[PDB]
């Protein structure tokens, strides 16, 4: 059912991951170059794109930016060595739904992919202040400009906007990282990223930190 685009620079690992993911009944398209991966992701809606930090002909960050122009909520996961991921950690957190270290254990990869899919599917209010949300296409517009929220950022905004009450970090973790089974610090990171996308200098932020409680949407 679900469709995976896979670009892995280690050939034997690429072949192993392709075969093992197909045993889970995923359709897997293996590609060797970033330019080809981008052309395919532009024409097909993949449920997961699994890449290294560097695709060879371009960085994953560059791939993700180019894809985001038309598919901003694309679901990208990064598999790489610890050193390579940590060298690009802030960048990766800002475009990738998740990351996983080499050497990979296949049972762990399979479990994490399943959780990511189920957290998106469960998720899958149309205005707030100057924002308009297109829930069918997972797109957000602040005025006549598209705001290129990532999948995680979109899911976080939808959770905040869908709740009349203030939400704790633990509630936001359970909604936006559903099925992934504990550290709420990640919520604070993605709140920071989301504010960076939505907020206008000299306006009140779109997100209020509520003392002793959590986060909620904020009026102008």
Numbering used by the authors: 2 to 125, 134 to 190, 192 to 230
Paper quotes:
In further support of our activation hypothesis, we have included an oxidized mimetic (RitRC128D) structure of RitR. The RitRC128D structure was sufficiently similar to RitRC128S to enable its solving via molecular replacement. Of note, the major difference between the RitRC128S and RitRC128D models was that no electron density was observed within the RitRC128D peptide QHDSLMKV, where “D” would be the position of the wild-type C128 residue (magenta colored region in S3D Fig). Although the RitRC128D structure might not be reflective of the actual oxidation state of RitR in vivo, the lack of electron density around the Cys128 Asp substitution does suggest that changes in oxidation at the Cys128 residue would be sufficient to destabilize the linker region, thereby initiating downstream structural rearrangements. Aside from its unstructured Cys128 region, the RitRC128D oxidized mimetic mutant maintains virtually identical hydrogen bonding and RD/DBD positioning to the RitRC128S structure, with the two (RitRC128S and RitRC128D) structures having an RMSD of 0.35 Å (219 of 221 Calphas; S3D Fig, compare colored and grey structures). Conversely, the C128D oxidative mimetic strain demonstrated a marked repression of PiuA protein levels and piu operon RNA levels, even surpassing wild-type repression in the R800 genetic background. However, the C128D mutant was much less affected by aeration, where no comparative lag was observed and the cells surprisingly attained an optical density of over 0.4, approximately twice that of wild-type. Conversely, the C128D oxidized mimetic mutant slightly increased in CFU numbers compared to that of wild-type (by a log of 0.1). Indeed, with two oxygens in its structure, an aspartate substitution would more mimic the sulfinic state of Cys128 rather than the sulfenic.
Here we describe the two-component-like orphan response regulator RitR (Repressor of iron transport Regulator) as the archetype of a novel family of peroxide-sensing transcription factors in the pneumococcus and related species. RitR contains an Aspartate-less Receiver (ALR) REC-like domain, which retains the common (α/β) fold of canonical REC versions, yet lacks “invariant” residues in its catalytic pocket required for typical phosphotransfer, including the phospho-accepting Asp residue crucial for the histidine kinase-response regulator phosphorelay.. Here we show that RitR regulates pneumococcal iron homeostasis in response to cellular peroxide concentrations through its single Cys (Cys128) located within the linker domain of the protein. Atomic structures of RitR in its oxidized and reduced states demonstrate a dramatic mechanism of activation that hinges on the helical unraveling and subsequent formation of an inter-protomer disulfide bridge to enable DNA binding and transcriptional regulation of Piu.
